[PDB]
Design a protein around this ligand. Structure first.
Ligand SMILES: O=C(CO)NCc1c(Cl)cccc1Cl
Length: 123
């Protein structure tokens, strides 16, 4: 029921995305890059991603695991590092801080989920 609950990650991720939306550091990443306004973005970035898209994919039940959610969120950060590569850019620093925040908080979500999988597969 609650120990090793394989669905608990969904609400944990919803809560984490809420905190992320509150962070001033997420401001550049809350919505898709305006591709019609900044067309050179697609010359550099193959797969755009943003937190509004992640939040909707989760809400729609279209992540099979928190690892799938984590893959999309990491893509937000790898896309920022590719488009904005300079350590001097304040946007780089923003992305860096928010990535560290995300990775800190997602850690337990993943480890708990994977432990639950080990438990149910074992038994
Ligand atoms: O990568 C991002 C996410 O919003 N921002 C960099 C950016 C700037 Cl500062 C200005 C115009 C376009 C873009 Cl993509």
């Amino acid at each position: 029921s609650m120990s090793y609950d394989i669905q608990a990650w969904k609400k944990q991720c919803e809560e984490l995305l809420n905190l992320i939306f509150q962070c001033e550091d997420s401001e550049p990443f809350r919505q898709p890059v305006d591709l019609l306004e900044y067309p050179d973005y697609r010359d550099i970035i193959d797969t755009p991603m943003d937190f509004a898209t992640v939040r909707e994919t989760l809400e729609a039940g279209n992540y099979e695991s928190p690892m799938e959610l984590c893959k999309d969120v990491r893509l937000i950060f790898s896309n920022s590092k590719a488009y904005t590569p300079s350590k001097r850019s304040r946007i780089y620093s923003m992305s860096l801080r928010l990535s560290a925040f995300f990775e800190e908080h997602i850690s337990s979500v993943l480890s708990d989920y994977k432990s639950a999988l080990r438990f149910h597969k074992r038994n």
